[PDB]
Design a protein around this nucleic acid. Sequence first.
RNA 1: UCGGAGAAAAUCUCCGAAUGAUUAUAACCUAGACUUACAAGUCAAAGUAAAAAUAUCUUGACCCAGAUA
Lengths: 48, 95, 52, 88, 315, 100, 141
Amino acid sequence: ARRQAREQRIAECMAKMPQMIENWRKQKRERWEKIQADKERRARLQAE
Amino acid sequence: LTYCSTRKGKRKTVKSVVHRFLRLHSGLWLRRKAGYKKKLWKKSTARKKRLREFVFCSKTQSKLLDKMTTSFWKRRNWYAGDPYQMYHDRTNLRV
Amino acid sequence: KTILVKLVSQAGTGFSFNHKRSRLREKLSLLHYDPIVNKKVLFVEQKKIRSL
Amino acid sequence: HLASADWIEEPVRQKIALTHKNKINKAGELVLTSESSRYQFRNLAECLQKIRDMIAEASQVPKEPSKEDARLQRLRIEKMNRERLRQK
Amino acid sequence: ERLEKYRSFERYRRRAEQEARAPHWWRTYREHFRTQKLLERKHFLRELRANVEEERAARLRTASIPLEAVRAEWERTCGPYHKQRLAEYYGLYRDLFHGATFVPWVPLHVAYAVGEEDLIPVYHGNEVTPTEASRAPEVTYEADKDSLWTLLFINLDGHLLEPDAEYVHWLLTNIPSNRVAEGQETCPYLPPFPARGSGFHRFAFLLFKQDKPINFSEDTRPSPCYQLAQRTFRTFDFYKRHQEAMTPAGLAFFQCRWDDSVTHTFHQLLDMREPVFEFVRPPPYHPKQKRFPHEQPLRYLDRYRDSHEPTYGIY
Amino acid sequence: KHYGIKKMEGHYVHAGNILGTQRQFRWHPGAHVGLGRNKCLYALEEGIVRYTKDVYVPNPKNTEAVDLVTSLPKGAVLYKTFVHVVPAKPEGTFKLVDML
Amino acid sequence: KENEAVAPEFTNRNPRNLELLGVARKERGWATVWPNREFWHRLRVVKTQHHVEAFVEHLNGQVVVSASTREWAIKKHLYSTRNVVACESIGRVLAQRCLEAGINFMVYQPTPWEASSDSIKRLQNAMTESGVMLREPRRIY
RNA sequence: UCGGAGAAAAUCUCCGAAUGAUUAUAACCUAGACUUACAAGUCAAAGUAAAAAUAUCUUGACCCAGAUA
Ligand SMILES: [Mg+2]
Ligand SMILES: [Mg+2]
């Protein structure tokens, strides 16, 4: 019973793992966007 | 060390050796590495790998441990399925 | 200044490893290798171990 | 002797001869050996066992080609060059 | 400050490469490890330059070059010089003629017929399977009439027993002119027989200029010859015998691996068990075993053991 | 500490051996010589140690080296010291396994 | 049978034997220098003021296959020695010679600007079409 | 106590560390070596596994108590 309970929980978590990884990958993308959203996209825009 | 005991008149084992080292029948001694469970977060991955290993003892260290333990700890033990069964003898040793 | 945290795998395994974060920085999360699953999975912070 | 032997079914025999030609002697006998232990009991065991695997893999079709190992890539790439040059 | 500066990585790179090739006092890595023709060429260039369509295609980066014509021109004009290198690279000269170098001149051509009009050209360094070369190939070298010649095929690397040897697959002698059917068949054609697991054997096709008809009785072989042992042969001795009337003029060599046809050759006509070779590396180096391997891990004892199974001795 | 030349020129070195240790690049990796994290130099092939000067060309990407290299006197180029191990054995040999 | 006689150890003399097997040594050092020399063969493309040349050379320094626009046969069919088409065309010629010599696997080490150059990209396109591999396989240990 | 610079390796002349932020999250296993009284400390081919190579820059033993699985 322990092995099956251990195995099934991993399967469910692994099954949803791709979506969570995509989300984590997604967030960091937007985080970086904000970095250049003002570093050059806005700050330099006025410096013109 | 107790060389002659009051009750039995024998030497006595130092139970600090028995709880730290393994003696192979050939004469070698195994030990762990000091600090292998300490502050692992700040140790490099290569450093941790070195720490986890089972390591041999020098000739003088082995000579000391032989003095600190009695003969019973030097006998040949026939354990079924022993994981050190193959390490109790030396092979191809000319020296 | 900084703290020692315990990142825990979200793959359903109990695998965890310790990392450092800055008290100011938000809670941490990283992709790391899980030996039991033999795949990269998300590790999210659950508990603090000590303040280093 | 692979072909003469009747215990193996004929369809299997043809597949085995093609797949494992390298192990067939000039006399037509299938020579397999092992030298992995100090006990002949164990040595013979793999010899007998290898025969069983051969029949099964020949009995069961290996549909899957699997991934292409770097050796197969080298064989395929060098083989392709032969055709281009051979086009004469 | 007087000297200018490179100002470009490429200029420095080229200068550095040249210096390494030049000899130096200090040790270095390398130590240890006619007129009418020219005028004609210029006239063609002007004609090509004048062509607006050629310029139009070039400026549109759509132009292309016919490889077929260049290949024929390359063979006639400067191909032999390159052909000499690929013979030097493979060591043909240093093997057949103990380091003597002969420039090939005749653009020799060989091809193995496969069923129908699908000829496998045997160029220099080509890869040809033994199966395809089961039968003798077609040789064409435009000897012209009144042109005595001689043809030789050799495997260079082989002779399982003898290291410094080279079998002759077949030697046609007294070949009069281009035609080859008129050659005296001193040796019949043997199919390639490279042993399994022995790597790439290099086979070469060499042609000598035959000055005067010489009977090669000492070289004739009993046809059919299936006593492989007899095929033992070394060019140097053969050439030395006839060096007066034999001068090489052509080359063509391919390299082949083992193949199923090789098993057929070893059994059917060679009538012997086929040898199998495997690439064996030297055993790994281990420092001499010590009674006390101080500070060494438990793996130390495994390095010096021979048998992987337990022994019990007197028990 | 104890930075120095562990193996001197001409010595028969076995693979993995360490040849020299350095805080800064007194020597540079040559042929069949590897570079370690700490910049120590070890033998990648069993052979003989050899030290030789040679021209130095850096990776194009690094700005500091390309700039310095570029801003050099047209006439000549800078050099460096390299360490090489000369392999002393063939990779392997072919032997007769069986006659079938 | 005298035919059956076989020496215990074979002595395959073919210089390209181990390299073709993939088991021969490649230089693995030169970590601090550019480019790396872990190649059995290398392609060096040099653009001179009026001419473009391509070579294939072994580690020992002997050129094997050389294609240059200075060669007469290429020039008569080649409009301008220095051109993108010339770079593309010379690559095609080099490939066939490389195919002829049996050199299927090769190493090319361009510089960042050279790699980005359209002409070099076009030249590599021709080599890829011919089947010459610009990357060698890793050694077998 | 340890590290960096000079004297130049014996005592002298000076600066810093008991970390710091960045981050690609940096796996397991295993030849040969460095250093070293012991103890601790370094580098690393090959193989396998993840991914699509990379962690970059500048330290305290044993016992004994804990924490979670
Ligand atoms: Mg020690
Ligand atoms: Mg590795």
